């Protein structure tokens with residue numbers, strides 16, 4: 001008798017009321033209050049509310065749950081547009097649906113942003129996806145980074161290619177790529193020179209690594225908490241090197257959700273993964289659900 005109730009459900013159209021702009025006034029102001037409370041910036045708040053008006057005005061609803069369902073689907077869609085720019089995001093399918101014999105990934109970013117840690121996370125995830133990997137340590141003058149990757153490479157049971165201190169960073173990356181060909185390794189991950197500040201020497205070296213290593217995907221690593229410094233790092237790597245995608249680290253330290261969402265709005269490249277902790281598994285695909293849960297209670 002549950003199919004008899006579903007047939008009855010076809011004849012329930014009289015309770016369906018069309019939403020008028022005037023109907024939205026109060027709830028739009030309450031959503032605004034909560035967004036701003038949850039550290040959502042003004043521009044993102046305005047975009048999100050405008051997308052809510054546009055997705056609601058046409059519609060017919062008969063109860064609060066139907067309204068909530070349009071609101072939630074609209075929120076998840078706006079958040080998706082903010083973070084990914086509606087670009088493809090799955091690195092595994094990127095690698096798998098690609099022709100490249102070893103798939104070469106290069107990583108950019110300044111010091112203390114979490115770059116060596118999320119390379120270990122990327123290694124961890126590709127292992128969980130049955131993809132073999134090696135790391136090329138091409139930050140050859142920051143001997144600290146050499147230690148960090150050496151620990152991770154050992155814990156993760158993965159080969160680390162490294163040179164002498166101060167070695168040609170393009171050699172480390174080139175050698176790692178031939179090593180990966182010879183051993184039929186699926187993916188190469190190249191660490192690049194982390195500094196306190198981008199500068200002219202770093203740019204020339206990155207471009208030399210790029211033209212000699214020929215990577216298939218370039219990822220910038222940004223601290224989701226660093227605000228305008230993060231936007232300044234992204235703009236300088238954009239103008240002088242170019243990259244394809246962003247990984248935001250420390251998103252777990254953004255309690256209310258809006259800080260990383262407000263940063264992403266001003267980024268021009270998609271955010272493809274998010275670091276959410278210090279452990280290897282603390283790497284999640286972009287998820288609108290993450291931001292909806294944090295922003296709203």
Ligand SMILES: Nc1nc2c(ncn2[C@@H]2O[C@H](COP(=O)(O)OP(=O)(O)O)[C@@H](O)[C@H]2O)c(=O)[nH]1
Nearest residue numbers: 111112113114115116117249250275276277278
């Ligand atoms: N809470 C949190 N901490 C992180 C995350 N990613 C990195 N960190 C921490 O940030 C600090 C610096 O990271 P590290 O990989 O050494 O940065 P690097 O110098 O750029 O290579 C470390 O203590 C990391 O544990 C994250 O997603 N969440």
